[PDB]
Design a binder for this molecule. Structure first.
Ligand SMILES: O=[N+]([O-])c1ccc(O)c(O)c1
Ligand SMILES: O=[N+]([O-])c1ccc(O)c(O)c1
Ligand SMILES: [Ca+2]
Ligand SMILES: [Cl-]
Ligand SMILES: [Cl-]
Ligand SMILES: [Fe+2]
Ligand SMILES: [Fe+2]
Ligand SMILES: [Fe+2]
Ligand SMILES: [Fe+2]
Lengths: 355, 356, 360, 359
């Protein structure tokens, strides 16, 4: 059942670059991503909105495409050279995956691009060529109190984390942190190319589903302001979880829900991982500071809800149920538990979440 | 039932000044307030620790007094003149309250002071005279990433909020914000002298009990650091609620628990209330943004748990039960309700707390 | 030349409330205060713009009034009761000052108001009645990265600081901080009613002139953002001084210049002064951490330039020259001196400013 | 011209640490540990080894007691052990003096190569290093001014294009630079790790070390360092700032250690890891290029820098810049700068911005 390593060389992946999300009401989505969140328009028409963060120079970090069923259509990684698109094609072909190459791109402002149904059922895109736009990094006349400054990562729900981890490691992603138990189950892994804690991450669950797309801010007060704004707009019900400090990654975070329930994380101030012997951190699944360092409870919807993903024909990918133990069940379910201090019943929670 | 307005003039109260808290293990409490929270020691011996915030010049903002039963011993307000302590004494005597006056103070660093058992059963102190100490407001060589800069307010649990409110208004406190419902019930009120949202507040519940004492920080990141530090110390279980943004008050906040479960709020960035026609804001009790503006749920312990208070002899005040509706029950209990948008079923909660 | 204490009781002043500035080009001024700084419009027409801060509930904190000569037309203080406007009139009449009373106000959204040519030549207004507006304190859908949240203070240039200080003390302002030297000269004083470091302040120099109006932010990053935005708009030449940490007041600060060179300070995180025995802090004029705690030099324009003020007829008040020693001259001038550490030659400056600079 | 070797360049990850010679170890310890809050990895009577809050390698700064304060080595970590062999072959082909120590020059570094590079600078290349407790979640230690990473070095060298070409051959990519309309280069910034820079060249007499830079999380952390220095009554050791840079867009501060070694505190520059990352060239007369808010650049910033040592520990001879001086063309008596290109309003002629002339 393992995914064999191709003999063909892996493409040299720089970073996560953009996501294409199918949305059902383009105007409602535009209000969320432009008016609430302040992303910058790179192109729009009656069918699509192309958006970028404050410090981006490539054409976009987010494409909103009107469609009948809300879903992730592609999660796109930029590769180092044009020849790396050829490498990506040969690599996935050797893996036995369905691939589609468009020499003029799938979306505006991207050139030669390869989309694939990857071995975990996810629609990945690889591209080098992209239309450069004005880098807005010093446009403080446009800067919002909640400004989103970079695209940081994706998070994928998949049933077998070790299987997916090994596949991503072969593609050159390096694991930085993970969550395990003493019995040897892996519940989640984080992995990177660009020298932050992650470009993508695997959350154990029924999949393929897209858990979230994450944008960063400069400072913690910028995340606070997003929350404050949502309260002023009386859409606080769309704040799912946070704001908090993560255990894994050490980042300050917030999770919010778009009009189609696509989950967006806002994230800041993780650490440098670019050294090849970067120390890998393993948390125990029962540690109540692993996800929220302050011990705040993880709402069940965070574990159970995630976005559909599409195949290359635009149809929804069938889901495979996780057979490994469930993080939700072992921590906050009827027979779950967590601790503040390992071995101490004081500050422990049994069959219950924290707080 | 109503508390009459005295003929005697009310004392001119400046602000909340300090609390004296009884604690059971002086060493454990010191470690919390000094090592974890960073408050500054004005004086300490084997029985008491006198602590002050970064910007304070009066002797202290907090006195920890070792004793057998953890409780509030005195909540103190400073008055404008020495003659206002005379006014306070005559005022509470007309109210028929027990009073006790000491020209040399009850605690170190306070001179002529009046303590009273007020009409709600709380131990109030009024004083003018205090020993000035080094104001540490520019001692950035001492400044902590979580620095507590000022004492901001107290919050009192009392069963009948309107009764208490009228009494505090006659005493010169002005109501800035409150929480009511559509059936004539008041659940909470905030009231001030110094021109911030409050110097004290009333929370409807069984009482007298002390809900919390609140200290300010300069910035929101200072509150975040307190949380981060508690995680590093592996004492995140002592974070009760927050961090968040309040609806009422608009302040950024955090609630933590000391070793005797006394609740401390960290608070920043409320607004100016010093004009006498300052607009009074009333929230509906079912508005899920009233306590946490982001809609985060209020944990039941925040409603049910609070500190004992002492009388002037040092004995615990008997608790009188609230008969008015319970904010817990009407918002997050089995028959509770809250809304995100008034009149919208979407984003409303029936018989449970927000966010799952 | 002491100003006597009246027998008539002083009005009970709450706080500074608004300033009326005469501006020469209303559109250019609106661009600065609304588009650059983010203040909120309460009312406007062809002649005036009425602006308020994020947390204000009275009608306005600033009125911009088109006129031929840019100047301060009124610094306004709110009093506690309607009766305090009568008290103000009686008080200033006893002081021998010219006064003008308008039962329906001088500017929109203010009711019964008294304006006075005060003993230092400044146009003060006292009022209680004002039209309440929507308080925007939780309108985070409007909140700017540089949001101005309150009006904090005024600062006045006057030739004789002790004379003015005594008069303001009789009026009920308490001095929180001052700058003096060891030879009896007062260079500046800060004084309050509302329980912050100040509602107004006196800066020694030729006057009457208005030094600045100050607005506060929530946090230091908000002030940084104003600077950053001015850079992006390529108007960094309108940043006069800062950003910095003050010694006096301990506030984080920035000084900028509007289209008519009216100086605006942005300010945050001073301390509580409401207790009646609040300790008064006196800094020595030669302490190089007194104005900028980090030792950064005070640009000469900060000491020399300030706005004209008008009398009740709208004519510019004549300027009276300061004869006391000049803060500029004694610190950064040719015979000037400043220290980092009292009594240490190392980190001291002789005949020049700090950090490697001299007067242009 | 410095030729491109046939031998492959070592794969450089990032700047890693500097070794600074200091004259009074206790006074230097007070500055770096007590004032700035850096974390001790090792110390004795001869040296102090210091790391930032988020570091896992042994150290980011070695303070070595010696007779003459100077930079002794600026060290870059390479990707594999074999890259140290590549460094050695590369610099030997360049004709540079090299010294190889299989067990390191300083504690907590293993196999290492030091070289006197073509610009006169003592560079070290290493892979092997002793891992230590990564303190990134130790909020019980976190100070209000916490220094979280080593970010970069800045080198003073007389001929910027000559140095830039050599660094490009070594794999560094230019992100930003400062030039004039007549083709003079005043400064260039260049990176390996995907930030604006790992090292930078400032036109001037050299070799000299301009500064070492550490990062903070947020801008308020830099403000606190200034506030703390005021409280300690050492504001005279704040040289320049705080400010926002034009070049790099980072929030910054420059301070001076007890031997006048300049330390920058820096935060919130941008991502440069894509290979077609857009370069940005600023005009030397643009008064927003160094401080975005137009604050004047203090003359000492342009004239003063640290000595550097050769592999024997002797001070490297200084070679004079012959290209135009940035100080002179901008803030000297014949200099000029502008706020808006072509606008006399907001321009400065023969003095610095904001009303000052040179002291
Ligand atoms: O600790 N977890 O909950 C994490 C850590 C990093 C992330 O970006 C995330 O989405 C989850
Ligand atoms: O803009 N300059 O002054 C710069 C920009 C970045 C730096 O790291 C520096 O030392 C100077
Ligand atoms: Ca003298
Ligand atoms: Cl609340
Ligand atoms: Cl000043
Ligand atoms: Fe994430
Ligand atoms: Fe409170
Ligand atoms: Fe001011
Ligand atoms: Fe630098």
């Amino acid at each position: 059942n393992e995914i064999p390593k191709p003999v063909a060389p892996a493409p040299d992946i720089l970073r996560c670059a953009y996501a294409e999300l199918v949305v059902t009401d383009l105007a409602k989505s535009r209000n969320f991503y432009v008016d609430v969140l302040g992303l910058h328009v790179s192109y729009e028409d009656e069918n699509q909105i192309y958006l970028r963060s404050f410090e981006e120079f490539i054409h976009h970090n987010l494409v909103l495409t009107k469609g009948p069923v809300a879903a992730l259509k592609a999660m796109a990684f930029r590769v180092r050279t044009p020849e790396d698109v050829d490498k990506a094609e040969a690599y996935y072909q050797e893996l036995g995956c369905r691939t589609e190459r468009r020499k003029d791109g799938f979306v505006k402002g991207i050139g030669d691009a390869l989309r694939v149904e990857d071995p975990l059922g996810f629609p990945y895109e690889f591209f080098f060529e992209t239309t450069h736009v004005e880098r807005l990094h010093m446009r403080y006349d446009l800067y919002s109190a909640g400004e989103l400054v970079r695209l940081d990562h994706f998070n994928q729900v998949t049933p077998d984390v070790p299987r997916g981890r090994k596949y991503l490691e072969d593609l050159g992603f390096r694991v930085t942190e993970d969550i395990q138990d003493d019995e040897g189950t892996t519940y989640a892994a984080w992995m990177h190319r660009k020298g932050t804690v992650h470009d993508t991450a695997l959350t154990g669950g029924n999949g393929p589903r897209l858990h979230h797309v994450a944008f960063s801010t400069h400072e913690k007060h910028n995340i606070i302001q997003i929350c404050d704004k949502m309260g002023a707009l009386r859409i606080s019900d769309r704040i799912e979880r946070g704001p908090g400090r993560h255990g894994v990654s050490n980042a300050f975070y917030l999770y919010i829900l778009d009009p189609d329930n696509h989950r967006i994380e806002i994230y800041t101030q993780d650490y440098y991982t670019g050294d090849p012997d970067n120390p890998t951190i393993t948390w125990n699944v029962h540690d109540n500071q692993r996800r929220d360092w302050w011990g705040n409870p993880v709402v069940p919807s965070w574990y159970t809800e995630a976005s559909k993903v599409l195949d290359l024909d635009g149809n929804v990918q069938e889901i495979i149920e996780r057979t490994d133990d469930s993080e939700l069940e072992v921590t906050i379910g009827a027979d779950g538990f967590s601790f503040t201090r390992a071995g101490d019943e004081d500050g422990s929670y049994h069959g219950q979440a924290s707080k």
